[PDB]
Design a binder for this molecule. Structure first.
Ligand code: CLA
Ligand code: CLA
Ligand code: CLA
Ligand code: CLA
Ligand code: CLA
Ligand code: CLA
Ligand code: CLA
Ligand SMILES: CCCCCCCCCCCCCCCC(=O)OC[C@H](COP(=O)(O)OC[C@@H](O)CO)OC(=O)CCCCCCCCCCCCCCC
Ligand SMILES: CC1=C(/C=C/C(C)=C/C=C/C(C)=C\C=C\C=C(C)\C=C\C=C(C)\C=C\C2=C[C@H](C)[C@H](O)CC2(C)C)C(C)(C)C[C@@H](O)C1
Ligand SMILES: CC1=C(/C=C/C(C)=C/C=C/C(C)=C/C=C/C=C(C)/C=C/C=C(C)/C=C/C2=C(C)CCCC2(C)C)C(C)(C)CCC1
Ligand SMILES: CC1=C(C/C=C(\C)CCC[C@H](C)CCC[C@H](C)CCCC(C)C)C(=O)c2ccccc2C1=O
Ligand code: SF4
Ligand code: SF4
Lengths: 139, 740, 80, 73, 69, 73, 40, 142
């Protein structure tokens, strides 16, 4: 399922809380080409080991911040990280990247979502939609 | 030699003077909006962001420090000139107990000549509260020509400092290796600057200041006293004043130092004639610290292998609980200017706070203790300076953490361990802040409610539930017994604040024992609460500058950003700069309470007039003990009562203070424009006004913009602090000049 | 959760996707602009509402708009 | 004194509320097409002139009143 | 119709330059639904809080521009 | 009485300025052309595009309350 | 030097020079003719 | 019979009592006497200080009308020279740079030509290019 030696860390007070065992947590895994020091999003510096790594964080934003640090602040750029959502029951949901291609570059087979066929100035007036559970952008 | 320089790195030309914003790449392009102006005045002296080369940054810092030295020299020379030409110093010297000091004269143009009040001796001018006259009298000044020569020398030194900056930047710029000789710098600055400075001042005092002050205190007129060089030229006068000077320098080299006991004493206390410290005590003091500093030099290995190494000491002091210990700190403090700035700012601010709290208890200058206005002004001024410097330390430390902190070089060292249990530190500190505020301010509110309800026996007072500071009383008792018991060769106590007799000069109390009771307990613990809260704010700024559970990437956003957005419920004021902005107000609050406590206690329990019988009548009588326990007492017996002298100042020589008083009450209120509002409203208003100016075809090319969020907060806090401090300054000066 | 809408004035500069810290936005093929790509918000339940995408948009008015709505644990960005 | 202060403060609160709820009306219940070219629409047309002349009168009062008070002081 | 160097007035009714005048920097001839590119001397509010400049170029449709020259 | 009545006039015109600009700009302005879509009371539109920070009409009322209190004082 | 002339012509220098000029005019006039409440 | 509550300062007992002790504003020793003389012709209240009457009457024209004309002339001069300099520099290649670095030659040339600002203003209004049309000004969405 989820495999990888955890990075050598001394432990900090900024880690997980009861939400991890009550609501959900997040896992980030990546392949490191050398055991080297990186920065915990929760505070402190830890060494990551050669090969597989696996880290548990409390928020998706922390996982993506770690991914950004891995992609930007290392000359052997780490582009292979994967972010999953881990539920208390045991279900693991693959989150990032969605289809294996980074969202920055366009990839075929994606579906447009939230796209409106008009411009921002063409939204309906509120008075024409009042007393209905709708908003001008929702229409 | 470890000297290494580069010749003519930057040509001296005037072209870049005509292109403002040249330093910044984002500003040198040219202004399109008004914000370009505000950025230009804000990113000017931030050399670290301008360039990535550390050597260039260090060179710029060196020359900028030369420039600040030149400015301070110009200020000192101006002070000496204005004390030499537009002052009654020569008049005051003959009659120091009947003439008020004055060194500012006002031109009569629109009726401001009323400010030229009668300072005694037929002189009309603004009374000064800096205490320069007492310092000059202690230094041995007797004529205005010497002051004029001092001013000329100060101007020459300022010009020399300016030339030094120009030379050491535009011509011969030091190398990076030169700047990182921290061992050599520390040796030369401990032995060559502090030790040598103390030795030179001790020599000046012994060979100049003591004879002149001894003749002055006896009753000799200033004009009769021999000029300072005549003592050196004819040592007969020096031997007459001090017999041991007949022995010459022989006992110094034979360790027969005791013969010098007459002019190198250990008396302690105050001089009865002037109310200041004994100059012999100060002479042995500055000599001893000179010897100590020269010995403290020669400690760090520089060029001959004979000395300690800072890195070895740092990496050798590690323990079980701290992992790597003090490892990597040497590279932190030798590669980042901001960490050095933070440490130095904190230590220096605490140092001026110590100066303020120690200069009033043992007044070192003649006739300074009896000039209550000068005492209060000096205490409050250096108090405020210390507070500002401490806040600046708290700021520039967070700047270092955001910019110069590198996780690679900090693994299991003390910095990383600090970054690991930061939540525990902040939580425990927050709890202690809440506990201190609750219990102390609740004692205050509880006393208020008990007094308002007609139950004074349920209060927290000396008559009611005591709450006595037993530990402070015990240490006062110990320090009162110190002469003879634990300091056998001392003659009197370090100061009369701890205890002893009442030293009073010219029928005015100079120093009498300062008793601590229930009110002192409450106020000291209130001080502790306020200080711990300010420390909490600044520590949260420093520790959480890199990231937090809310925003995990604040380091990439920078050090000075307004927010992350309206998401996550709202992320306003999360940057370290915002923590500094919030800590400035709490520093203001704490220091205001400190100066208020000092002023009221000084007026109520020490200052006053002594009768020929010996009875002491205080400025505000003994009302501090029974009034400072309720907030209503602070409001009525301190603010309302003592503000009479500043509200009734119109029509007299003190009118300016009154005006300035109101001025403060204005600017504070004005600041609430910027703190309470946001920039979108002002942007829309500017849109409407721009339409107005456009209708007449008078629209400006530089598009006007509302101030940024960070700029708005900065302007608000600046005008707020200015208004509050000016109000307090006017109130204090009027009250202290109106209490004799 | 918050709502994210992309209007037909998008030029496909992909700055909004890069600026998003919680991976809410995506780049899908299109034909209305020269770059032939438009932004999308499939993973909109993870959006916090930091408006970084709006800040990144260079059009005369934002071709991407964020309307804050119902607040969840994810929307508040809580770690507890 | 109490009655005057009380009813004047009440009047100020009500006068603020009138403008607040009028702005709420403009946000919610205002239909531009129905009230086309009438006085309500004409208000939003020369609103820039309204705000500019109001800013001018406010600044003109404030500058020369504060100046007189400070001059007398 | 609108070519290079054409001074045009903007009628988008929500852009920063509504009623202002700009010049046609380029026109793209394809199925693009906002093909005209107009640049302006003034800059808009675009940018993070504290930025010293905005954006002086935008894309418009042909129908929302009035030729002035 | 002359000076204080003119000061009261300044306060009235300034409070009216704040409330009126809020009411008229509630629908939208150059900084926020689509404010009506966001409702009457919203916090801001983020630090982008200049900073926003109290661009809503509710914020105009909140600012005008201070001037109402000052004029009443 | 051209650079010095350009620096002297910048906004703060011009604004402060004009302010000192106006202040000197007003101060000298008030010295030589003080207390002018109205045209008598 | 106008201003029955305001008496001439030349006879008001409070003004005459307080004018002996008038302070000297400048270094001139008799500035207070000059002020007392000059203010003795005004209209003093019961407390003896001069009051300015502004209702349009020409007997008290010195209180408002003359300073009003003076200030209006000076302010029009300032506004006109500023607007002319702005419009002049607007045709150059770097109008913003000349906003922060003042073109002192052109600046002074406009400085010295502002004394005829009323004639220039009326000619501007009649020429029609003093005021722009409403359709030529950028406006915010309604
Ligand atoms: C911290 C330094 C300091 C301070 C605060 C003061 C403060 C004061 N001095 Mg003083 N002074 C100082 C240092 C200082 N001095 C030094 C070092 C000297 C020795 C040279 C003097 C010598 C001195 C004399 C001889 C006199 C004063 C006087 C005064 C008082 C009147 C103010 C004044 O001179 O303005 C006067 C007004 C002006 C200078 C305005 C002129 C226009 C200015 C310079 C504008 C600047 C720009 C200008 C256009 C030039 C362009 C430069 C550009 C290229 C950058 C005032 C209390 C006077 C006094 O107290 O008389 C009773 C007086 O007569 N001072
Ligand atoms: C005995 C040697 C000596 C002395 C006295 C100093 C003194 C000083 N250094 Mg320094 N320094 C030294 C050696 C020394 N340095 C060496 C060897 C290095 C290289 C490792 C440095 C590198 C260094 C840096 C990198 C910096 C300083 C700075 C400073 C100044 C800090 C400001 C201060 O203390 O205010 C007190 C100010 C004064 C007391 C005024 C002193 C005015 C002149 C300069 C003193 C000249 C004294 C000289 C011995 C002649 C007097 C003898 C006789 C005429 C009586 C201070 C003047 C800082 C600075 O920029 O200041 C310029 C700074 O950033 N130092
Ligand atoms: C910077 C420090 C300094 C300096 C420059 C001087 C300078 C001087 N001292 Mg001196 N002195 C000093 C500190 C200093 N003192 C201190 C700290 C003490 C106390 C230990 C003394 C105690 C002292 C005595 C007891 C005598 C001098 C004397 C002298 C003079 C002749 C000595 C000489 O130059 O031969 C090298 C000379 C003017 C002699 C003299 O003739 O002066 C009256 C003398 O008898 N000094
Ligand atoms: C030894 C003292 C010292 C030194 C060398 C520095 C050096 C620096 N600071 Mg620092 N700082 C200090 C003390 C010091 N600071 C203290 C005591 C505080 C606490 C208040 C701060 C708070 C602080 C902040 C919050 C910031 C800096 C920044 C900076 C950097 C340059 C940008 C800057 O401030 O210039 C520009 C300076 C100004 C625009 C100041 C002009 C406006 C002042 C406040 C007006 C003062 C008015 C005056 C008191 C009274 C006038 C009255 C009027 C009527 C005439 C630079 C590394 C900035 C940075 O991030 O750099 C990395 C930054 O954001 N500092
Ligand atoms: C007849 C009078 C009247 C009526 C019917 C309404 C009705 C309404 N107003 Mg309105 N308003 C009024 C007067 C009135 N208002 C006045 C006078 C003002 C100016 C102060 C306002 C300002 C105002 C604003 C700014 C807003 C409304 C809104 C609303 C709508 C619902 C939200 C609301 O108010 O509930 C919720 C109300 C509250 C939660 C009130 C909480 C405040 C409490 C009562 C203060 C308590 C003080 C405290 C207890 C003091 C203790 C003292 C002790 C220590 C001794 C609703 C249509 C809102 C809207 O847009 O909805 C469409 C909105 O944003 N009104
Ligand atoms: C005593 C505090 C104070 C003062 C003086 C002002 C003044 C002003 N506010 Mg204001 N405001 C305040 C508190 C204050 N406010 C507070 C607490 C709030 C609540 C957040 C607001 C909310 C508010 C809003 C919402 C609005 C205003 C507006 C205005 C302007 C209206 C014009 C006017 O009244 O007279 C004219 C102005 C003055 C008399 C002030 C100038 C005073 C100085 C002394 C003049 C000289 C400047 C001086 C030479 C500068 C030297 C600086 C140098 C030393 C560094 C004016 C600038 C309105 C506005 O912009 O109108 C166009 C507006 O929309 N304010
Ligand atoms: C309501 C406001 C108001 C206004 C706008 C004016 C306006 C004017 N009054 Mg006026 N006036 C007023 C109230 C007012 N008055 C009141 C209440 C009184 C009674 C005290 C007067 C008594 C008065 C006199 C006695 C005279 C004016 C005159 C004038 C004119 C002066 C012409 C000038 O210098 O330009 C001017 C049109 C003068 C006139 O006749 O101008 C034709 C003149 O001699 N006024
Ligand atoms: C004097 C009475 C009035 C003040 C009473 C208040 C005292 C309250 C706490 C006792 C101080 C104990 C210090 C021992 C602790 C001590 O010496 O630690 C030393 C220890 C490091 O031991 P090592 O030998 O491993 O250290 C090697 C070092 O040299 C690092 O290289 O540090 C730790 O164990 C972590 C510190 C935990 C610290 C807990 C935080 C305490 C915060 C509150 C302290 C407040 C004091 C305020 C007043 C000064
Ligand atoms: C031309 C010009 C400009 C522009 C000027 C413009 C566009 C002006 C526009 C003006 C407009 C549109 C309207 C003006 C209205 C003026 C009124 C209503 C004046 C009223 C006067 C009264 C009521 C006089 C009142 C009494 C008159 C009397 C003499 C006593 O005192 C008593 C007292 C005070 C009662 C600038 C601003 C661009 C630059 C300037 O340098 C020149
Ligand atoms: C002197 C006299 C007289 C006269 C009087 C008069 C003439 C009066 C008037 C009065 C007036 C004339 C008043 C007015 C007032 C007004 C106001 C107070 C207003 C307000 C408004 C508002 C509040 C607004 C709001 C809104 C909006 C904004 C939009 C929508 C709508 C609405 C409306 C809601 C007589 C003969 C009798 C007798 C003798 C004496
Ligand atoms: C009033 C106000 C404005 C508008 C104020 C502006 C645009 C500043 C205008 C400053 C003028 C142009 C100059 C005054 C200050 C100068 C330093 C004066 C220099 C004087 C010398 C030349 C003599 C904001 O932009 C703002 C932004 C964020 C929070 C609150 C507020 C806010 O309260
Ligand atoms: S930033 Fe704006 S223009 Fe660029 S891709 Fe995103 S929505 Fe389109
Ligand atoms: S109110 Fe201002 S500071 Fe707060 S989140 Fe909105 S834009 Fe940022």
């Amino acid at each position: 399922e989820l495999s990888g030696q955890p990075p050598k860390f001394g432990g900090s007070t900024g880690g997980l809380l009861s939400k991890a065992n009550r609501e959900e947590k997040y896992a980030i895994t990546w392949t490191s080409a050398s055991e080297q020091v990186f920065e915990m999003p929760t505070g402190g510096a830890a060494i990551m080991n050669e090969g597989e790594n696996l880290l548990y964080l409390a928020r998706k934003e922390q996982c993506l911040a770690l991914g950004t640090q891995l992609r930007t602040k290392f000359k052997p750029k780490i582009q292979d990280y994967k972010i999953y959502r881990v539920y208390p029951s045991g279900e693991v949901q693959y989150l990032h990247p969605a289809d294996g291609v980074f969202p920055e570059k366009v990839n075929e087979g994606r579906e447009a979502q939230g796209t409106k066929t008009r411009r921002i100035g063409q939204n309906p007036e509120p008075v024409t939609i009042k007393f209905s559970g709708k908003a001008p952008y929702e229409v | 030699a470890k000297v290494s320089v580069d010749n003519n790195p930057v040509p001296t030309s005037f072209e870049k003077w005509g292109k403002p914003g040249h330093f910044d790449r984002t500003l040198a392009r040219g202004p399109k909006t008004t914000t370009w102006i505000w950025n230009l005045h804000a990113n000017a002296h931030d050399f670290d962001s301008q360039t990535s080369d550390l050597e260039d940054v260090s060179r710029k810092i060196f020359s900028a420090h030369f420039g600040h030295l030149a400015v301070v020299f110009v200020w000192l020379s101006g002070m000496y000139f204005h004390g030499a030409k537009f002052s009654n110093y020569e008049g005051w010297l003959a009659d120091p107990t009947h003439i008020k000091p004055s060194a500012q004269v006002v031109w009569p143009i629109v009726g401001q000549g009323i400010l030229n009040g009668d300072v005694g001796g037929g002189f009309h001018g603004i009374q000064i509260t800096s205490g320069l006259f007492y310092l000059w009298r202690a230094s041995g000044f007797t004529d205005s020509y010497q002051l004029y020569c001092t001013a000329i020398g100060g101007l020459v030194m300022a010009a020399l400092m300016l030339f030094a900056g120009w030379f050491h930047y535009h011509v011969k710029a030091p190398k990076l290796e030169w700047f990182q000789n921290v061992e050599s710098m520390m040796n030369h600055h401990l032995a060559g600057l502090l030790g040598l400075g103390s030795l030179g001042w001790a020599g000046h005092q012994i060979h100049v200041s003591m004879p002149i002050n001894k003749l002055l205190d006896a009753g000799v007129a200033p004009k009769d006293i021999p000029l300072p060089h005549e003592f050196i030229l004819e040592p007969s006068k020096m031997a007459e004043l001090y017999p041991s000077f007949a022995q010459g320098l022989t006992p110094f080299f034979t360790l027969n130092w005791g013969v010098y006991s007459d002019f190198l004493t250990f008396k302690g206390g105050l001089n009865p004639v002037t109310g200041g410290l004994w100059l012999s005590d100060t002479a042995h003091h500055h000599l001893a610290i000179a010897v100590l500093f020269i010995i403290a030099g020669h400690m760090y290995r520089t060029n001959w292998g004979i000395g300690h190494s800072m890195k070895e000491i740092l990496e050798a002091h590690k323990g079980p609980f701290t992992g790597e210990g003090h490892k990597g700190l040497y590279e932190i403090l030798t590669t980042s200017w901001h960490a050095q700035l933070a440490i130095n700012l904190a230590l220096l601010g605490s140092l001026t706070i110590i100066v303020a709290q120690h200069m009033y208890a043992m007044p070192p200058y003649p006739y300074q203790a009896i000039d209550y206005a000068t005492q209060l002004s000096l205490f409050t001024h250096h108090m405020w300076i210390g507070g500002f410097l401490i806040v600046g330390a708290g700021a520039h430390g967070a700047i270092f953490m955001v910019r110069d902190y590198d996780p690679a070089k900090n693994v299991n060292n003390l910095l990383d361990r600090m970054l690991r249990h930061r939540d525990a530190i902040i939580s425990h500190l927050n709890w202690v802040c809440i506990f201190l505020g609750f219990h102390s301010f609740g004692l205050y509110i509880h006393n208020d409610t008990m007094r308002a309800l007609g139950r004074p026996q349920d209060m927290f007072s000396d008559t009611a539930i005591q709450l006595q500071p037993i530990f402070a009383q015990w240490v006062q008792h110990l320090h009162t017994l110190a002469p003879g018991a634990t300091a056998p060769n001392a003659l009197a106590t370090a100061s009369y604040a701890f205890g002893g007799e009442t030293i009073a000069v010219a029928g005015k109390v100079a120093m009498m024992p300062i008793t601590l009771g229930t009110a002192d307990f409450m106020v000291h613990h209130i001080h502790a609460f306020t200080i711990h809260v300010t420390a909490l704010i600044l520590l949260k700024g420093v520790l959480y500058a890199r990231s937090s559970r809310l925003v995990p990437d604040k380091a990439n956003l920078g050090f000075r950003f307004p927010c992350d957005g309206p998401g996550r419920g709202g992320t306003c004021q999360v940057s370290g700069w915002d923590h500094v902005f919030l800590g400035l107000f709490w520093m203001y609050n704490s220091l205001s309470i400190v100066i208020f406590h000092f002023s009221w206690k000084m007026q109520s329990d020490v200052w006053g007039t002594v009768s020929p019988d010996g009875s002491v009548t205080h400025v505000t009588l003994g009302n501090f003990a029974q009034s400072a326990i309720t907030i209503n007492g602070w409001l009525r017996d301190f603010l309302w009562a003592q503000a009479a002298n500043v509200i009734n100042s119109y029509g007299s020589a003190l009118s300016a203070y009154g005006i300035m008083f109101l001025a403060g009450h204005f600017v504070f209120a004005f600041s609430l424009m910027f703190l309470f509002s946001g920039r979108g409203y002002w942007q829309e208003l500017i849109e409407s006004i721009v339409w107005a100016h456009n209708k007449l075809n008078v629209a400006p090319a530089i598009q006007p913009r509302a101030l940024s969020i960070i700029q708005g907060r900065a302007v608000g806090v600046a005008h707020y602090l200015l208004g509050g401090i000016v109000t307090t300054w006017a109130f204090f000066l009027a009250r202290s000049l109106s209490i004799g | 959760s918050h709502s994210v809408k992309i209007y037909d004035t998008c030029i496909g500069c992909t700055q909004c996707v890069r600026a998003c810290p919680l991976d809410v936005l995506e780049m899908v093929p299109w034909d209305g602009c020269k770059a032939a790509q438009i932004a999308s918000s499939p993973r909109t339940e993870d959006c916090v509402g930091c408006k970084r995408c709006e800040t990144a948009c260079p059009t005369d008015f934002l071709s991407i708009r964020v309307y804050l709505g119902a607040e969840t644990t994810r929307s508040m960005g809580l770690a507890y | 004194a109490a009655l005057y202060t009380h009813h004047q403060y009440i009047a100020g609160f009500l006068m603020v509320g009138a403008f607040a709820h009028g702005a709420i009306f403009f946000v919610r219940d205002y239909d531009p097409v129905a009230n086309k070219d009438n006085v309500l629409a004409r208000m939003l047309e020369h609103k820039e002139a309204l705000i500019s002349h109001l800013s001018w009168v406010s600044l003109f009062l404030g500058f020369h009143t504060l100046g007189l008070y400070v001059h007398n002081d | 119709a609108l070519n290079r160097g054409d001074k045009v007035r903007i009628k988008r009714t929500e852009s920063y330059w509504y009623g202002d005048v700009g010049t046609v920097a380029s026109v793209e001839k394809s199925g693009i639904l906002y093909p005209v590119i107009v640049r302006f001397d003034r800059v808009n509010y675009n940018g993070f809080s504290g930025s010293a400049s905005g954006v002086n170029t935008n894309n418009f449709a042909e129908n929302e521009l009035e030729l002035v020259q | 009485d002359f000076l204080v009545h003119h000061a009261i006039a300044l306060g009235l015109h300034t409070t009216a300025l704040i409330l009126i600009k809020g009411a008229l700009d509630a629908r939208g302005s150059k900084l926020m052309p689509d404010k009506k879509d966001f409702g009457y009371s919203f916090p801001c539109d983020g630090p982008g595009r200049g900073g926003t920070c109290d661009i809503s009409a509710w914020d105009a009322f909140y600012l005008a309350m201070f001037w109402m209190l000052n004029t009443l004082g | 030097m051209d650079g010095l002339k350009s620096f002297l012509s910048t906004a703060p220098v011009m604004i402060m020079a004009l302010l000192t000029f106006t202040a000197g005019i007003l101060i000298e006039f008030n010295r030589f003719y003080p207390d002018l409440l109205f045209h008598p | 019979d106008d201003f029955a509550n305001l008496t001439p300062c030349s006879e008001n007992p409070a003004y005459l009592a307080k004018s002996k002790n008038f302070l000297n504003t400048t270094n001139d020793p008799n500035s207070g006497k000059i002020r007392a003389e000059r203010y003795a012709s005004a209209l003093c209240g019961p407390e003896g200080y001069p009051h300015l009457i502004v209702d349009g009457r020409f007997t008290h024209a010195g209180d408002f009308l003359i300073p009003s004309i003076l200030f209006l002339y000076i302010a029009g001069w300032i506004g006109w020279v500023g607007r002319s300099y702005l419009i002049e520099i607007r045709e150059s290649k770097n109008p913003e740079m000349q906003e922060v670095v003042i073109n002192v030659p052109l600046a002074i040339k406009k400085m010295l030509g502002g004394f005829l600002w009323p004639l220039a203003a009326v000619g501007e209004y009649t020429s029609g290019k003093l005021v722009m049309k409403d359709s030529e000004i950028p406006t915010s969405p309604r």
